[PDB]
Amino acid sequence: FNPWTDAALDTIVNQALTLYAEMRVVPAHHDAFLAAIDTVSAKLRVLPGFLSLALKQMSGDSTMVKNYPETYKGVLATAYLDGVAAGTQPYFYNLFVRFADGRAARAAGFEALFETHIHPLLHAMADGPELLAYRAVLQSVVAGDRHAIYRGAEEIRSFLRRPVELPERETVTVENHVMVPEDKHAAWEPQVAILLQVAQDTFEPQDEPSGVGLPGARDNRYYRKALSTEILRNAHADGGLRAYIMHGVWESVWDHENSHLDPRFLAAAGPVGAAAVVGPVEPFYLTRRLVVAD
Ligand SMILES: [Mg+2]
Ligand SMILES: [Mg+2]
């Protein structure tokens, strides 16, 4: 069940494809792991049809995605960073490798690169047990930012060529993970797309003069607009379930959490959340590497 093999990759084509991994890395292997990612990204960036690569460290967990009462807002905002600072958790890293189309993805030989450079570092200490990675191939269904919604294959490629999450900007990424019944997913996708209009348009206070909003805080309901939103579908159903990630980038944890309290968002998300039979789980991430094509 490896979706990164030649054969798996043969089965898919004319749109952006993301090779995607969720990994755990222990401190003893961390420096080597980042060196390995840098070795791998140098090799990938020069390949035909390569768009971007993002390495994101899980930093906390959204509570407002669950619609807990506002007293719980942001209480796990930095909890994963704290686990690294306590040594109680490994590093959790997700990797996004975006290609122009299936031919580019297929040609890239990513599985080999991963096996050579990254796989050997994904073990605990003794040496110890292998920490298994989640692996997927993901399609970008629809995407958007503060100015426009991107629906065509080429418009979405272009969006993926200019990621906003440059590490030095200290943006906060969210990945809202859900599974929808496979027999419902086609009908559901158009409902999800209204979330991109909400993301493009909504902020608090609504009259903020720069047209972006004010920074969120624990003690207010303000927020700046999302920086970017992208709907990722797993290219392969998991039997009767289809996995999605609503991939968002925000200026801060508080902007995100406060966005979830806005009645405009709640009204639009209600119907979308109705079809989710697993999740939502929506962690926070910091972008540790961002690499674009040469
Ligand atoms: Mg090139
Ligand atoms: Mg969210």
From TrEMBL:
Superkingdom of the source species: Bacteria
Keywords in alphabetical order: Metal-binding
Binding site for Mg(2+) 2: D294
CT0912-like C-terminal domain residues: 141-288
Residue positions binding Mg(2+) 1: H256, H260, E282
GO molecular-function terms, A-Z: metal ion binding
Entry annotated with the keyword Cell inner membrane: no
Domain CT0912-like N-terminal: 16-103
UniProt-recorded name of the protein: Uncharacterized protein
Lineage, top ranks: Bacteria, Pseudomonadati, Chlorobiota, Chlorobiia, Chlorobiales
